[PDB]
Write an enzyme that holds these catalytic residues in place. Structure first.
Site, PDB file in Angstrom:
ATOM      1  N   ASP A   1       0.970  -1.134   0.148  1.00  0.00           N
ATOM      2  CA  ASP A   1       0.280  -0.644  -0.293  1.00  0.00           C
ATOM      3  C   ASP A   1       0.534   1.059   0.201  1.00  0.00           C
ATOM      4  O   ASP A   1       1.278   1.839   1.034  1.00  0.00           O
ATOM      5  CB  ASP A   1      -0.768  -0.286   0.776  1.00  0.00           C
ATOM      6  CG  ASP A   1      -1.514   1.157   1.362  1.00  0.00           C
ATOM      7  OD1 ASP A   1      -2.171   1.656   0.589  1.00  0.00           O
ATOM      8  OD2 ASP A   1      -2.100   1.059   2.990  1.00  0.00           O
TER       9      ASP A   1
ATOM     10  N   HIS B   1       7.647   4.233   6.296  1.00  0.00           N
ATOM     11  CA  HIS B   1       7.988   3.789   4.667  1.00  0.00           C
ATOM     12  C   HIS B   1       8.615   4.574   4.327  1.00  0.00           C
ATOM     13  O   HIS B   1       9.234   5.701   5.215  1.00  0.00           O
ATOM     14  CB  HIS B   1       6.350   4.159   3.933  1.00  0.00           C
ATOM     15  CG  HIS B   1       5.629   2.979   3.696  1.00  0.00           C
ATOM     16  ND1 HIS B   1       5.616   1.835   2.842  1.00  0.00           N
ATOM     17  CD2 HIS B   1       4.590   2.999   4.433  1.00  0.00           C
ATOM     18  CE1 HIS B   1       4.954   1.038   2.564  1.00  0.00           C
ATOM     19  NE2 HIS B   1       4.076   1.818   3.343  1.00  0.00           N
TER      20      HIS B   1
ATOM     21  N   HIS C   1       7.032  -2.152   4.178  1.00  0.00           N
ATOM     22  CA  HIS C   1       6.813  -3.562   3.907  1.00  0.00           C
ATOM     23  C   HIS C   1       8.278  -4.694   2.990  1.00  0.00           C
ATOM     24  O   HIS C   1       7.504  -5.157   2.735  1.00  0.00           O
ATOM     25  CB  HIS C   1       5.319  -4.162   3.986  1.00  0.00           C
ATOM     26  CG  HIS C   1       4.567  -3.775   4.560  1.00  0.00           C
ATOM     27  ND1 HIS C   1       4.825  -4.396   5.362  1.00  0.00           N
ATOM     28  CD2 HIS C   1       4.106  -2.892   4.203  1.00  0.00           C
ATOM     29  CE1 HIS C   1       3.689  -3.598   5.709  1.00  0.00           C
ATOM     30  NE2 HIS C   1       2.925  -2.770   5.410  1.00  0.00           N
TER      31      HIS C   1
ATOM     32  N   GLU D   1       4.332  -9.387  -0.761  1.00  0.00           N
ATOM     33  CA  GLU D   1       3.314  -8.968  -0.570  1.00  0.00           C
ATOM     34  C   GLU D   1       2.508  -9.185  -2.270  1.00  0.00           C
ATOM     35  O   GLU D   1       2.525  -8.106  -3.398  1.00  0.00           O
ATOM     36  CB  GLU D   1       2.512  -7.210  -0.311  1.00  0.00           C
ATOM     37  CG  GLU D   1       1.457  -7.092   0.028  1.00  0.00           C
ATOM     38  CD  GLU D   1       0.787  -6.043   0.948  1.00  0.00           C
ATOM     39  OE1 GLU D   1       1.705  -4.978   1.746  1.00  0.00           O
ATOM     40  OE2 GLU D   1      -0.450  -6.233   1.272  1.00  0.00           O
TER      41      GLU D   1
ATOM     42  N   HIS E   1      -1.272  -8.808  -1.519  1.00  0.00           N
ATOM     43  CA  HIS E   1      -2.603  -8.784  -0.861  1.00  0.00           C
ATOM     44  C   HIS E   1      -3.646  -8.519  -2.131  1.00  0.00           C
ATOM     45  O   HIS E   1      -4.475  -8.754  -2.142  1.00  0.00           O
ATOM     46  CB  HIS E   1      -2.482  -7.381  -0.712  1.00  0.00           C
ATOM     47  CG  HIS E   1      -4.074  -7.162   0.588  1.00  0.00           C
ATOM     48  ND1 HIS E   1      -3.487  -5.866   1.061  1.00  0.00           N
ATOM     49  CD2 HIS E   1      -4.903  -6.951   0.992  1.00  0.00           C
ATOM     50  CE1 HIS E   1      -4.506  -5.734   2.042  1.00  0.00           C
ATOM     51  NE2 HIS E   1      -5.857  -6.931   1.972  1.00  0.00           N
TER      52      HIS E   1
ATOM     53  N   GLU F   1       0.725  -9.704   4.779  1.00  0.00           N
ATOM     54  CA  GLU F   1      -0.507  -9.766   3.636  1.00  0.00           C
ATOM     55  C   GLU F   1      -0.245 -10.555   2.746  1.00  0.00           C
ATOM     56  O   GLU F   1      -0.994 -10.350   1.523  1.00  0.00           O
ATOM     57  CB  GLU F   1      -1.386  -8.539   3.363  1.00  0.00           C
ATOM     58  CG  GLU F   1      -1.230  -7.532   4.281  1.00  0.00           C
ATOM     59  CD  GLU F   1      -2.220  -6.335   4.255  1.00  0.00           C
ATOM     60  OE1 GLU F   1      -1.620  -5.434   3.237  1.00  0.00           O
ATOM     61  OE2 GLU F   1      -3.785  -6.228   4.452  1.00  0.00           O
TER      62      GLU F   1
ATOM     63  N   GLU G   1       0.593  -4.139  13.407  1.00  0.00           N
ATOM     64  CA  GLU G   1       0.490  -2.981  12.965  1.00  0.00           C
ATOM     65  C   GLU G   1      -1.426  -2.566  13.860  1.00  0.00           C
ATOM     66  O   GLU G   1      -2.827  -3.204  14.187  1.00  0.00           O
ATOM     67  CB  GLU G   1      -0.427  -2.963  11.561  1.00  0.00           C
ATOM     68  CG  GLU G   1       0.299  -3.571  10.209  1.00  0.00           C
ATOM     69  CD  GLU G   1      -0.117  -3.095   8.893  1.00  0.00           C
ATOM     70  OE1 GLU G   1      -1.010  -2.605   8.891  1.00  0.00           O
ATOM     71  OE2 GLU G   1       0.978  -3.929   8.264  1.00  0.00           O
TER      72      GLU G   1
ATOM     73  N   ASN H   1      -8.021   4.427  -7.611  1.00  0.00           N
ATOM     74  CA  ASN H   1      -7.018   4.717  -7.419  1.00  0.00           C
ATOM     75  C   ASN H   1      -7.375   4.738  -5.392  1.00  0.00           C
ATOM     76  O   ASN H   1      -8.772   4.561  -4.870  1.00  0.00           O
ATOM     77  CB  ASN H   1      -6.235   6.559  -7.364  1.00  0.00           C
ATOM     78  CG  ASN H   1      -7.499   7.762  -7.191  1.00  0.00           C
ATOM     79  OD1 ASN H   1      -7.960   7.418  -6.029  1.00  0.00           O
ATOM     80  ND2 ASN H   1      -8.127   8.290  -8.305  1.00  0.00           N
TER      81      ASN H   1
ATOM     82  N   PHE I   1      -6.627   7.374   1.412  1.00  0.00           N
ATOM     83  CA  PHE I   1      -5.685   6.252   2.337  1.00  0.00           C
ATOM     84  C   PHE I   1      -4.237   6.544   2.329  1.00  0.00           C
ATOM     85  O   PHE I   1      -3.480   5.178   2.635  1.00  0.00           O
ATOM     86  CB  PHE I   1      -6.312   4.957   1.821  1.00  0.00           C
ATOM     87  CG  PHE I   1      -7.515   4.831   2.979  1.00  0.00           C
ATOM     88  CD1 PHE I   1      -7.792   4.301   3.896  1.00  0.00           C
ATOM     89  CD2 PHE I   1      -9.226   5.275   1.812  1.00  0.00           C
ATOM     90  CE1 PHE I   1      -8.044   3.977   4.247  1.00  0.00           C
ATOM     91  CE2 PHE I   1     -10.065   4.658   2.572  1.00  0.00           C
ATOM     92  CZ  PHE I   1     -10.443   4.195   3.997  1.00  0.00           C
TER      93      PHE I   1
ATOM     94  N   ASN J   1      -1.288   8.082   6.405  1.00  0.00           N
ATOM     95  CA  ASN J   1      -1.649   7.892   7.507  1.00  0.00           C
ATOM     96  C   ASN J   1      -0.956   8.295   9.266  1.00  0.00           C
ATOM     97  O   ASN J   1      -0.502   7.725   9.178  1.00  0.00           O
ATOM     98  CB  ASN J   1      -2.049   6.023   7.638  1.00  0.00           C
ATOM     99  CG  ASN J   1      -2.665   5.821   6.026  1.00  0.00           C
ATOM    100  OD1 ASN J   1      -3.581   5.899   6.039  1.00  0.00           O
ATOM    101  ND2 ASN J   1      -2.188   5.074   6.041  1.00  0.00           N
TER     102      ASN J   1
HETATM  103  O1  LIG Z   1      -3.842   2.681   5.122  1.00  0.00           O
HETATM  104  C1  LIG Z   1      -5.106   1.573   4.808  1.00  0.00           C
HETATM  105  C2  LIG Z   1      -4.857   0.438   5.422  1.00  0.00           C
HETATM  106  O2  LIG Z   1      -5.791  -0.420   4.717  1.00  0.00           O
HETATM  107  C3  LIG Z   1      -6.090  -2.231   5.271  1.00  0.00           C
HETATM  108  S1  LIG Z   1      -7.048  -3.237   3.810  1.00  0.00           S
HETATM  109  C4  LIG Z   1      -8.827  -2.156   4.350  1.00  0.00           C
HETATM  110  C5  LIG Z   1      -8.710  -0.862   4.410  1.00  0.00           C
HETATM  111  C6  LIG Z   1      -9.540  -0.675   2.172  1.00  0.00           C
HETATM  112  C7  LIG Z   1      -8.989  -1.493   1.665  1.00  0.00           C
HETATM  113  C8  LIG Z   1      -9.071  -1.084   0.085  1.00  0.00           C
HETATM  114  C9  LIG Z   1      -8.935   0.484  -0.003  1.00  0.00           C
HETATM  115  C10 LIG Z   1      -8.648   1.434   1.046  1.00  0.00           C
HETATM  116  C11 LIG Z   1      -8.786   0.809   2.171  1.00  0.00           C
HETATM  117  C12 LIG Z   1      -4.242  -2.863   5.583  1.00  0.00           C
HETATM  118  O3  LIG Z   1      -4.576  -3.908   6.068  1.00  0.00           O
HETATM  119  C13 LIG Z   1      -3.986  -1.900   6.042  1.00  0.00           C
HETATM  120  O4  LIG Z   1      -2.431  -2.182   6.284  1.00  0.00           O
HETATM  121  C14 LIG Z   1      -3.881  -0.431   5.348  1.00  0.00           C
HETATM  122  O5  LIG Z   1      -2.680  -0.748   4.288  1.00  0.00           O
HETATM  123 MG   LIG Z   2      -2.156  -4.383   1.855  1.00  0.00          MG
END
Ligand SMILES: OC[C@H]1O[C@@H](SCCc2ccccc2)[C@H](O)[C@@H](O)[C@H]1O
Ligand SMILES: [Mg+2]
Lengths: 1014, 208
Positions: A192, A348, A382, A407, A409, A452, A528, A588, A592, A595
């Site tokens: 991310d 990061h 990461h 990763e 994800h 992840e 986290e 996009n 998010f 943080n």
């Molecule tokens: O800063 C965002 C966080 O998002 C969630 S996914 C669930 C939230 C989400 C999913 C898709 C788009 C935006 C947010 C991750 O588990 C964290 O590590 C971190 O990356």
């Molecule tokens: Mg991720």
């Protein structure tokens, strides 16, 4: 090379790349190695290179291998090419930025062609081996030297080395490097963060002799009480073995040699076929070693020399050694035999101008700010970091979790690749090369298998590989439900303190319950927690209460250190902070990417001070006149610590003093305070203590405050009456208005709306907007979650408030009456807020204006039990005047909310109006101060027990504007005064997270204010 | 138990359609002020009396057991009718089993005859209480019986209690929890203590 397409084949991750090893400088002098001076054998190639961009690798002309293209520009290396405008950076969280079709990548695959012309010394070509090192290239690249193909590499975050001995000539040489944005390695790099590309870390040439040190490992073992150590060093060589070759390892503490050993090559017998002829193991005894920890980072210097029996040096290598032991025993993670408490953060590698290029100055700035805010640990989120990061963490003292670049994800299911044996080769290079690079750093205490990627058989295989080659550090991995057979530590992300979240297959138990599940024995450290997005960290105190009470809860890493915003320029060339979608990147994940506890320029958010206070190393208890001080240090005595105390009555200082702290690690000290003053005047007495460091350290200035706490002492309630005034306020009743006059003051109440609509001092109007009830706030990032206009999330707070009509509800007048008493005028009002026939709220108010010119406001509110709980219950107005300063008696000085106010202290505070606004990049409700008894602004004074915020921006403007640079100051000043305000949450930001004790669920509320002109 | 109320203010005013009485009292012990209460009584043309109460508690006094009103009514009635949690005795940290409904019991079921006499018989979450010709409305906790708090505190055995003339009513805005984790050390949890420093409640007293 165009027909093999190595970047679309997970079986090929390199061609002709040399073996991984710890950092080398190839010194030719033992003193230069000992003192860490720059080595003539290691040249940097950083600087100006030539660069051309192409839409695909088939568009690269063949002449580019032989000579420079005329259409190439000059650029600085290292760099990301999206930071120079060649194509757009992409910000995506989970969804892959390309079609998911492993292992193929798009045919439109942006290609960067870099080249450099450089001289090589004559002496470099006669003898020995010349290699080129690329510390990081994103994502895959082919390399040519003087027109001839050298090799190929993937994995963006670990160095790639190639032998250039056969390609170099004396005079002018030319490198050509072709870098691809996408490759099959992109499937394993779905972190991310901004997706960027280029030669983004250092490039260098290293010269070694033909007979050379090719690897070395350093290990330390202790007796039961750490009074005797053995340093074991394994050295391996390459080249021609001779009988006259010798290895010496020596250990230095400063300028004193502490231990030394010498041997010829030849290891002990390993199996039926013999031993390693090309390795040797030296054992060095060290008595009473100084131990390394984050509290006291004692380092030694190890020098390794390859020399002949008659004493001629061939080459020297060196590293920093820290003596420490990390083990898990009886369910606790121990360092040097004591149980750790991890004050951690995720970090990061991000810079707002240079993207993913890290320099030393930025790294040092991050480390000083971390230690100054009571952090002791950092998680490489990461991927492996720039090699200088681990050196700085060794020297200043931080524990590091080092993490493999893996990763996946965005795969469905998440373990689609990590359960496939065809990807076991690609994953094993990412884990084994990280361990071979970083295993000598004392600051690295835990390895991580990545992030992840679900749970697959590939993770179990690699867990067992690390335990076998490096038994001296635990291994952690969170995927597949945080407690699989591939982890030594239970390491959940965003598990709550008390509330279970029972998801199918991968439940997140409450952390206190997880510990005690049938069979479970491991320690728990959250990889986290406390997602710091925007105005956040509500409920942080609740984690730290649990960490201190339960032995097997050993802390966690906050998510995360710094906002990943980038800088853009407007028309006038003014810089502004940009986030996902601001570069035309689509799809996009919008804001998010922000943080952090600090802004991208390393200025603090208000949540940083809450983290500093909960993570303090001293804990305090008050009993009568006695303060008990407890140390939470494991290793140091408090030798740089002075306790200051102060007693104040409603902001006014009465007594103060200092006492030196003398407290052993994990010990207690009792401090008895002098007989405190007994004042006759009404008000609450407050005691504040603070721990101050009188001397500067490597990481802090003289006078640094490291810990604080505040308590209430005796209170005297006020039993005196207000002085009986002679003047009576006069009431004038028209059809439109009630008007009250007293002296030069005048108040006007509108009879159709039922609100105070204007107020005069002399002839100067004081209000631009009527004083009205307010039940809503501009939504925080935690209120919105993942909800958007395309895809509404009906469970988010903002969606519940909108569906119920809280933003749209209209006040309807039920009653508006006036009465003259003996010495005062009394106005009584009632309003109902409705939406489509449903009544949401009722407010009943009295206004009492007496002969002293004070206006006392009483408010009673009812909230329908079936509407979603409101964000606040208060009043708002727009004042006509702008003043420079705000003065208040209440919690401060920084922004504080009902579930984030432990760090704030009660006192008299005074700040310019602009410090009362927190400039979050995504605008929201901000700047609240709680626990306030008196507020002064211009000629006005409000008294009561309230929360307030004051600024030039309406709640409406904050809700409608997506970026802080688009806000404009309104005429006058918006004041919000609340009797009650909901918590902000922050356990995560994608599901409701405000705890039940911070919701406004009581149905009936009452508060009172006095508004006067002092 | 010993604190004396001292009058700070007592004023009256005719409004358009009502009479308003305003009072303030301070409770003291050896020069220390423990509590302050400020009250308004509004008597309108329907014959209702609306009582508003605001109390301050000194932060360094031990949290009080209750914040409410009490009086001794002249009359004895057979039945008590209320809309609130019931039908049995319930307290702020022992009220999950009670349900909200209209309850109706003889006066003697409103007294729990514990062998060692104490505070007893409270009902929480109450919106309306009827006893004889009187009706109280609000959001309160109450207990009603023939025994004063004073008599319950001075008597060691339930057989030595005697009914007083009339009926003792206690109406509370707030009441502390009863504890019971053990009985030999303080056991009332922090969320059931009256520690907020400022309290407000309101009642309407009418004759229906
Ligand atoms: O800063 C965002 C966080 O998002 C969630 S996914 C669930 C939230 C989400 C999913 C898709 C788009 C935006 C947010 C991750 O588990 C964290 O590590 C971190 O990356
Ligand atoms: Mg991720």
């Amino acid at each position: 090379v165009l027909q093999r397409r190595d970047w679309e084949n997970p079986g090929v991750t390199q061609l002709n790349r040399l073996a991984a090893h710890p950092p080398f400088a190839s010194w030719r002098n033992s003193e230069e190695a000992r003192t860490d001076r720059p080595s003539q054998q290691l040249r940097s190639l950083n600087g100006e290179w030539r660069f051309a961009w192409f839409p695909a690798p088939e568009a690269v002309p063949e002449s580019w291998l032989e000579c420079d293209l005329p259409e190439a520009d000059t650029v600085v290396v290292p760099s990301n090419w999206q930071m120079h405008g060649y194509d757009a950076p992409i910000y995506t969280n989970v969804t892959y930025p390309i079609t998911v079709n492993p292992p193929f990548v798009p045919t439109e695959n942006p290609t960067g062609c870099y080249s450099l012309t450089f001289n090589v010394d004559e002496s470099w070509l006669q003898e020995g081996q010349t290699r080129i090192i690329f510390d990081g290239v994103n994502s895959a690249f082919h390399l040519w030297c003087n027109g001839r193909w050298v090799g190929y590499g993937q994995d963006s975050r670990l160095p790639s080395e190639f032998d250039l001995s056969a390609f170099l000539r004396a005079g002018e040489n030319r490198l050509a490097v072709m870098v691809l944005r996408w490759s099959d390695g992109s499937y394993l790099e779905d972190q991310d963060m901004w997706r960027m590309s280029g030669i983004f870390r250092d490039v260098s040439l290293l010269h070694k002799p033909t007979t050379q040190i090719s690897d070395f490992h350093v290990a330390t073992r202790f007796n039961d009480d750490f009074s005797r150590a053995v340093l074991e060093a394994e050295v391996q060589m390459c080249g021609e073995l001779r009988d006259y070759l010798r290895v010496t390892v020596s250990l230095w503490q400063g300028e004193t040699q502490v231990a030394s050993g010498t041997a010829p090559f030849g290891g002990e017998i390993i199996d039926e076929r013999g031993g390693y002829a090309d390795r040797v193991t030296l054992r060095l005894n060290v008595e009473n070693p100084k131990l390394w920890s984050a509290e006291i980072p004692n380092l030694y210097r190890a020098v390794v020399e390859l020399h002949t029996a008659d004493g001629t040096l061939i080459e020297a290598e060196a590293c920093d050694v820290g003596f420490r032991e990390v083990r898990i025993e009886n369910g606790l993670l121990l360092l040097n035999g004591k149980p750790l408490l991890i004050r951690g953060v995720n970090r990061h590698e991000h810079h707002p101008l240079h993207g993913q290029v890290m320099d030393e100055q930025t790294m040092v700035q991050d480390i000083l700010l971390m230690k100054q805010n009571n952090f002791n640990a950092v998680r490489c989120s990461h991927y492996p970091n720039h090699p200088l990061w681990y050196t700085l963490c060794d020297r200043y003292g931080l524990y590091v979790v080092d993490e493999a670049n893996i990763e996946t994800h965005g795969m469905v299911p998440m373990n689609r690749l990590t359960d496939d044996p065809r990807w076991l080769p690609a994953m094993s290079e990412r884990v084994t090369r990280m361990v071979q690079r970083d295993r000598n750093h004392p600051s690295v205490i835990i390895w991580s298998l990545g992030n992840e990627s679900g749970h697959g058989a590939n993770h179990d295989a690699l867990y067992r590989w690390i335990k076998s080659v490096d038994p001296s550090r635990p291994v952690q991995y969170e995927g597949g439900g945080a407690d699989t057979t591939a982890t030594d530590i239970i390491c959940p992300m965003y598990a709550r303190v008390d509330e279970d979240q029972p998801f199918p297959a991968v439940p997140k138990w409450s952390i206190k319950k997880w510990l005690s599940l049938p069979g479970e024995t491991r320690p728990l450290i959250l990889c986290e927690y406390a997602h710091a997005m925007g105005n956040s960290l509500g409920g942080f105190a609740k984690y730290w209460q649990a960490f201190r009470q339960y032995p097997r809860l050993q802390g966690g890493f906050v998510w995360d250190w710094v906002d990943q915003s980038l800088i853009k320029y407007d028309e006038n060339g003014n810089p502004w902070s940009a986030y996902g979608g601001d570069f035309g990147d689509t799809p996009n994940d919008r804001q998010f990417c922000m943080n952090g506890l600090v802004f991208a320029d390393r200025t603090p958010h208000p949540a940083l001070t809450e983290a500093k206070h909960q993570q303090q190393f001293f804990q305090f208890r008050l009993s009568g006149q006695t303060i008990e001080v407890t140390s939470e240090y494991l290793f140091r005595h408090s030798d740089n610590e002075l306790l200051h105390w102060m007693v104040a009555l409603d902001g006014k200082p009465l007594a103060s003093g200092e006492v030196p702290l003398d407290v052993a690690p994990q010990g207690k000290q009792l401090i008895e305070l002098p007989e405190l003053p007994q004042p006759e005047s009404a008000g609450q007495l407050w005691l504040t203590v603070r721990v101050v460091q009188p001397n500067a350290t490597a990481w802090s200035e003289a006078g640094h405050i490291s810990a604080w706490q505040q308590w209430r002492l005796a209170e005297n309630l006020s039993v005196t009456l207000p002085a009986a005034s002679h003047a009576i306020p006069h009431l004038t009743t028209s059809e439109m208005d009630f008007c009250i006059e007293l002296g030069n003051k005048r108040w006007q109440f509108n009879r159709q709306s039922g609100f105070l609509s204007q107020m005069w001092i002399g002839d100067k109007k004081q209000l631009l907007t009527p004083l009205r009830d307010q039940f809503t706030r501009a939504p925080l990032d935690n209120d919105i979650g993942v909800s958007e206009a395309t895809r509404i999330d009906p469970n988010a707070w903002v969606e519940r408030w909108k569906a119920a009509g809280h933003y749209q509800a209209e006040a309807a007048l039920l009653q508006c009456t006036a009465d003259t008493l003996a010495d005062a005028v009394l106005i009584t009002t009632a309003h109902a807020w409705q939406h489509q026939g449903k009544t949401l709220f009722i407010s009943r108010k009295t206004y009492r204006i007496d002969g002293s010119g004070q206006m006392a406001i009483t408010v009673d509110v009812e909230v329908a039990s079936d509407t979603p709980h409101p964000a606040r219950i208060g009043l708002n107005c727009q004042l006509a005047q702008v003043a420079e300063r705000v003065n208040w008696l209440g919690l401060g000085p920084q922004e504080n909310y009902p579930d984030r106010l432990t760090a704030a202290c009660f006192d008299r505070w005074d700040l310019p109006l602009s410090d009362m606004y927190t400039p979050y990049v995504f605008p929201s409700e901000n700047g609240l101060r709680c626990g306030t008894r008196e507020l002064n602004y211009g000629p006005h004074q409000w008294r009561g027990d309230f929360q307030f915020n004051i600024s030039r921006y309406s709640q409406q403007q904050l809700m409608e504007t997506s970026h802080r640079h688009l806000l404009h100051a309104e005429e006058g000043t918006w004041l919000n005064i609340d009797g009650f305000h909901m918590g902000i949450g922050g356990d995560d930001s994608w599901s409701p997270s405000v705890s039940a004790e911070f919701q406004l669920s009581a149905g009936r509320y009452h508060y009172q204010l006095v508004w006067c002109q002092k």
